[PDB]
């Protein structure tokens, strides 16, 4: 355990932080887009609900 | 084109959203901790600088 890092080690640590943060953004961004599709799914459910309600009220 | 999920499929998507969000929590939290150690490296470099200033001025 020597806390005196070396220039090369320091740069590693920094660039590794960069990478961690980038992964996090990448995960969040993929997650975000994901919800674009999940919503289209929820919406498809509605269309179907509406469909049956309509189908039900059109045959008295 | 057909966005109607089954019950099984829905549960999977919710469950996976949760997992993604936890992976995010986990990276962030580990990163938080890591910085705690990184700081000790910064601070150690400073104790070393004091040593040298001192060393220099005590041979002045």
């Amino acid at each position: 355990i020597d806390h005196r890092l070396t220039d090369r080690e320091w740069a590693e640590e920094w660039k590794h932080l960069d990478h961690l943060l980038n992964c996090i953004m990448d995960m969040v961004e993929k997650t975000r887009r994901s919800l674009t599709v999940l919503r289209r799914c929820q919406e498809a459910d509605r269309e179907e609900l509406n469909y049956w309600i309509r189908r039900y009220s059109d045959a008295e | 084109i057909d966005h109607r999920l089954t019950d099984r499929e829905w549960a999977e998507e919710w469950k996976h959203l949760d997992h993604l969000l936890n992976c995010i929590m986990d990276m962030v939290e580990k990163t938080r901790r890591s910085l705690t150690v990184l700081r000790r490296c910064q601070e150690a470099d400073r104790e070393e600088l004091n040593y040298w200033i001192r060393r220099y001025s005590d041979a002045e």
Partner: peptide, 11 residues
């Protein structure tokens, strides 16, 4: 080197 640095976080 010490244990818990930003590297070491795998990923």
């Amino acid at each position: 080197v010490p244990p818990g640095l930003p590297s070491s976080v795998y990923a």
